[PDB]
Design an enzyme around this catalytic site. Structure first.
Site, PDB file in Angstrom:
ATOM      1  N   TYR A 146      27.963  13.669  22.815  1.00  0.00           N
ATOM      2  CA  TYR A 146      28.644  13.154  21.639  1.00  0.00           C
ATOM      3  C   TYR A 146      27.639  12.902  20.517  1.00  0.00           C
ATOM      4  O   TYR A 146      27.870  13.311  19.373  1.00  0.00           O
ATOM      5  CB  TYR A 146      29.432  11.880  21.955  1.00  0.00           C
ATOM      6  CG  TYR A 146      30.078  11.318  20.713  1.00  0.00           C
ATOM      7  CD1 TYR A 146      31.185  11.942  20.138  1.00  0.00           C
ATOM      8  CD2 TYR A 146      29.534  10.215  20.075  1.00  0.00           C
ATOM      9  CE1 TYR A 146      31.757  11.450  18.966  1.00  0.00           C
ATOM     10  CE2 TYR A 146      30.103   9.710  18.916  1.00  0.00           C
ATOM     11  CZ  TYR A 146      31.205  10.337  18.364  1.00  0.00           C
ATOM     12  OH  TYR A 146      31.779   9.840  17.212  1.00  0.00           O
ATOM     13  N   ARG A 170      24.794  -1.617  18.001  1.00  0.00           N
ATOM     14  CA  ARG A 170      24.899  -2.733  17.066  1.00  0.00           C
ATOM     15  C   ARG A 170      26.355  -2.974  16.669  1.00  0.00           C
ATOM     16  O   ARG A 170      26.761  -4.110  16.420  1.00  0.00           O
ATOM     17  CB  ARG A 170      24.066  -2.468  15.801  1.00  0.00           C
ATOM     18  CG  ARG A 170      24.084  -3.624  14.778  1.00  0.00           C
ATOM     19  CD  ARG A 170      24.810  -3.217  13.482  1.00  0.00           C
ATOM     20  NE  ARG A 170      23.912  -2.502  12.573  1.00  0.00           N
ATOM     21  CZ  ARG A 170      24.059  -1.263  12.095  1.00  0.00           C
ATOM     22  NH1 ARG A 170      25.113  -0.490  12.343  1.00  0.00           N
ATOM     23  NH2 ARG A 170      23.119  -0.776  11.301  1.00  0.00           N
ATOM     24  N   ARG A 205      37.985   1.499  18.320  1.00  0.00           N
ATOM     25  CA  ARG A 205      37.041   2.573  18.613  1.00  0.00           C
ATOM     26  C   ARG A 205      36.129   2.178  19.778  1.00  0.00           C
ATOM     27  O   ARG A 205      35.724   1.018  19.894  1.00  0.00           O
ATOM     28  CB  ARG A 205      36.213   2.935  17.371  1.00  0.00           C
ATOM     29  CG  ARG A 205      36.955   3.754  16.311  1.00  0.00           C
ATOM     30  CD  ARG A 205      36.563   3.380  14.864  1.00  0.00           C
ATOM     31  NE  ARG A 205      35.194   3.729  14.470  1.00  0.00           N
ATOM     32  CZ  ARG A 205      34.805   4.905  13.971  1.00  0.00           C
ATOM     33  NH1 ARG A 205      35.671   5.900  13.802  1.00  0.00           N
ATOM     34  NH2 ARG A 205      33.533   5.105  13.637  1.00  0.00           N
ATOM     35  N   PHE A 265      11.739   9.697   3.786  1.00  0.00           N
ATOM     36  CA  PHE A 265      13.147   9.936   4.063  1.00  0.00           C
ATOM     37  C   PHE A 265      13.366   9.883   5.569  1.00  0.00           C
ATOM     38  O   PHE A 265      14.378   9.355   6.016  1.00  0.00           O
ATOM     39  CB  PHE A 265      13.570  11.315   3.520  1.00  0.00           C
ATOM     40  CG  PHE A 265      14.871  11.799   4.080  1.00  0.00           C
ATOM     41  CD1 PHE A 265      16.074  11.412   3.499  1.00  0.00           C
ATOM     42  CD2 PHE A 265      14.892  12.635   5.194  1.00  0.00           C
ATOM     43  CE1 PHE A 265      17.284  11.818   4.056  1.00  0.00           C
ATOM     44  CE2 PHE A 265      16.107  13.066   5.750  1.00  0.00           C
ATOM     45  CZ  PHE A 265      17.301  12.668   5.162  1.00  0.00           C
TER      46      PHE A 265
END
Ligand SMILES: CC(C)=CCC/C(C)=C/CC/C(C)=C/[C@@H]1[C@@H](COP(=O)(O)OP(=O)(O)O)[C@]1(C)CC/C=C(\C)CCC=C(C)C
Ligand SMILES: [Mg+2]
Ligand SMILES: [Mg+2]
Length: 332
Positions: free
Chosen positions: A137, A184, A194, A254
């Site tokens: 997933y 978290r 969910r 980034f």
């Protein structure tokens, strides 16, 4: 200077992204628009995935075909009930800017959007069972992002071919962020119906994942939490490897800043009953400033690893495992 539609895209980026807006806009040269558009395309894709008012029967072809909509100038979607729905309703603006990118960037973005759509559609009719399925997933929704970003860096030629070639390390980078967010966000996810924690793990503690929200189950909940954090820590060696290969400063920032934010998040969540009571927060401005070179990133990682290390309860079923992984990380 910037076209009308491109200016809109950057507004959409700033409106919808807390973690990535600033680092994306600081990217050099062609990478900036390429990564901004990649972000918005995936944001639109996720907004469809997440929308529980769209039936699975309607959702599957939308996710499967989404990559093709990039090439259909007036494709849009007006039936979303989600908060980020401007990116769907004004998709033509985003797809226009996609078609303005060089071919080499188009190819990567569309390929990733295709593969993620297939993967997301696959998980509409199942929950996450095993730890292996959890990796699967996370590959589909986050690992592929890291793989796509890496291919864009190499295509831009600001980074070496190896970055885009090493899909294992790219995958791990994405997995580390996604597992961190899932851990978290237990409660917020629970409250919107969910479930992303792997059932082969949580079912060893409680009969329903929602049971971790009950005060009487806190001890079991924290034990499971620490098992999942221990799993996520196994990605840190690859994160270090990945970051150590980056040459361009804007690309390094980034990539590194969200990783160190994730490490700081895991450390804050470790053995923390508050995960089951609300959203645990971290330092952000400080880390944004300090996480701009490898030696500093390593030191940040080791500091958070020692914070976790000296907090490990001897009685925790994962305590041996948490110590072992921390040792490996400390030894690279
Ligand atoms: C293209 C770009 C930067 C991002 C695309 C993000 C989108 C929309 C994906 C659609 C599926 C989703 C939602 C995935 C989850 C992203 C969090 O969003 P959010 O929860 O809204 O954050 P915030 O609220 O804090 O702003 C996620 C955890 C994956 C992050 C993994 C990355 C970035 C790979 C790093 C790897 C290397 C750099 C090798
Ligand atoms: Mg989402
Ligand atoms: Mg989603």
């Amino acid at each position: 200077s910037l076209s009308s539609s491109l200016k809109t895209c950057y507004k959409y980026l700033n409106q919808t992204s807390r973690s990535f807006a600033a680092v994306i806009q600081a990217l050099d040269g062609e990478m900036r628009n390429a990564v901004c558009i990649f972000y918005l395309v995936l944001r639109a894709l996720d907004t469809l995935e997440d929308d529980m008012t769209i039936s699975v029967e309607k959702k599957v072809p939308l996710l499967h075909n989404f990559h093709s909509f990039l090439y259909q100038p007036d494709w849009r979607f007006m039936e979303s009930k989600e908060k980020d729905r401007q990116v769907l309703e004004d998709f033509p603006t985003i797809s226009l800017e996609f078609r303005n990118l060089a071919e080499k960037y188009q190819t990567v973005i569309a390929d990733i959007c295709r593969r993620m759509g297939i993967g997301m559609a696959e998980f509409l009719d199942k929950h996450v069972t095993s730890e292996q399925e959890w990796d699967k997933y996370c590959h589909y929704v986050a690992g592929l992002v890291g793989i796509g970003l890496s291919r864009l860096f190499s295509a831009s030629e600001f980074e070496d071919p190896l970055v885009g070639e090493d899909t294992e390390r790219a995958n791990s980078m994405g997995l580390f962020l996604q597992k961190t967010n899932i851990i978290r966000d237990y409660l917020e996810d629970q409250q919107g119906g969910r479930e992303f924690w792997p059932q082969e793990v949580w079912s060893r503690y409680v009969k329903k994942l929602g049971d971790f929200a009950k005060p009487e189950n806190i001890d079991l909940a924290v034990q499971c939490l620490n098992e999942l954090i221990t799993n996520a820590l196994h990605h840190i060696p690859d994160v270090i490897t990945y970051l150590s290969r980056l040459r361009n400063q804007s690309v390094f920032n980034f990539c590194a800043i969200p990783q160190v934010m994730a490490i700081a998040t895991l450390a804050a969540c470790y053995n923390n009953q508050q995960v089951f009571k609300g959203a645990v927060k971290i330092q952000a401005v400080t880390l944004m400033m300090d996480a701009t070179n490898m030696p500093a990133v390593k030191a940040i990682i080791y500091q958070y690893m020692e914070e976790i290390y000296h907090r490990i309860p001897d009685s925790d079923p994962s305590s041996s495992k948490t110590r072992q992984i921390i040792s490996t990380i400390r030894t690279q």
